[PDB]
Structures are given as C-alpha cells and as structure tokens.
Amino acid sequence: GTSKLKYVLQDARFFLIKSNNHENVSLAKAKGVWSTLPVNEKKLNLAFRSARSVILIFSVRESGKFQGFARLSSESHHGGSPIHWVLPAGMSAKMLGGVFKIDWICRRELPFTKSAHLTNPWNEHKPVKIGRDGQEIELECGTQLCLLFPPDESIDLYQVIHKM
C-alpha cells in the first residue's frame, strides 16, 4: 500500500542526488549511508533540522533513470570506518568524509520517460529529471515523483515512521 509512504512524505523536503557511478549507489543501498561534497552537506544538515523528513532521490549520471529514494536519519558525521566509495575524479575522501545515515524507502528503478510530466518549480520548471547534485525538489513535484516509483515490497516503513 501507499498509506505509510504518503505519511512519510508529508511536509518532507526532497533533494536530487546525482551520483557519478552505479557503484556508490549500490554501496549506499547495502550500508544505508551517503556522502556528498561540503556544499550539499551543509544544505542537508540544515534541512534535516527543519523538516519531519528529508528525502534523497538518487539518479546515476547517464543512466536515464532514478534508482530509488531514501530518508535522512541523521546529520553528517566524520571519523567512522572509511566508507570505500569509488571516489569520483576531483573528489577526495576528505571531501566525502561527512556521512549521512539513510533509511531506504524504495530501491526500485524509475526511468525518466515516466517522469516527463513532472517539472520542478525550484529548477525553473525544468523536467524533474534535470538538475545538479543537491537540487532541491519542490514539495508537490517531489511527492509525486516518489509515488511514481514501483512499490518496494521488501521495505517496511514502520521502522522509518517511528524515527519521525
């Protein structure tokens, strides 16, 4: 069903994640972690304090798809086990040192062809598939893009609902 999903998405904030590789999204799906550059780290730390839910919607560059979406369950932290990211060119471990804990809500893919009717008022009304890493997605466009994903029946949102 979609009832607990809508409950999670109520008054949430949505951020677009553009990973440069599939490997790190894979790693993020396994370990429930994500790291971004300092500029977006600050943005997500600020958003986590400000909304009942901060939703990250993932898309690997040049895949033509979103790969799922997840909920921030913490602010970033530095000093844990060095998460073996496939560092992208121009990025160092120090830059990606801030680690957000996340609870996945859907690990299923959604092809861009299916979100062509959705545009983002915070990105000049461009199709929601278009945007840099960190682009915030406006409440209604974000909500509807999430509802477009196939249900991920392996996930039980009771766990995520209580942290709210």
Ligand X SMILES: CNc1ncnc2ccsc12
Q: How far is the CB of 129 from ligand X (least distance, A)?
A: 16
* CA 144 to each of CA 50, 115, 147: distance values in angstroms, whole numbers, following the listed order: 21, 9, 5
85 is in an annotated binding site: yes
Residues 21-60, interacting with ligand X (CB under 6 A): 21, 24, 35-37
Q: Which of 15, 69, 85, 104 binds ligand X (CB under 6 A)?
A: 85
Paired tokens of 44 = 């997500």
Q: How many CA atoms lie within 13 A of 8 on its CB side?
A: 29
152 is in an annotated binding site: no
Residues 6 or more apart in contact with residue 118 via CB below 8 angstroms: 127, 128, 141, 144, 145, 148
156 is in an annotated binding site: no
DSSP code of residue 62: T
d(CA 79, CA 99): 9
Closer of 133 and 138 to ligand X (Cβ): 133
Binding of ligand X at residue 19 (CB under 6 A)? yes
120 is in an annotated binding site: no
DSSP per-residue codes, 18-43:
EES-HHHHHHHHHH-EE---HHHHHH
Binding of ligand X at residue 67 (CB under 6 A)? no
Q: How far is the CB of 123 from ligand X (least distance, A)?
A: 17
Q: Which of 5, 47, 70, 96 binds ligand X (CB under 6 A)?
A: 96
Closer of 37 and 157 to ligand X (Cβ): 37
Closer of 19 and 123 to ligand X (Cβ): 19
The continuous run of DSSP H or E covering 148 comes out as helix 139-148
Binding-site residues for RNA, in ranges, read 18-20, 34-35, 85, 133
Binding residues for ligand X, per CB under 6 A?
19-21, 24, 35-37, 85, 88, 96, 133
Binding-site residues, in ranges, read 18-20, 34-35, 85, 133
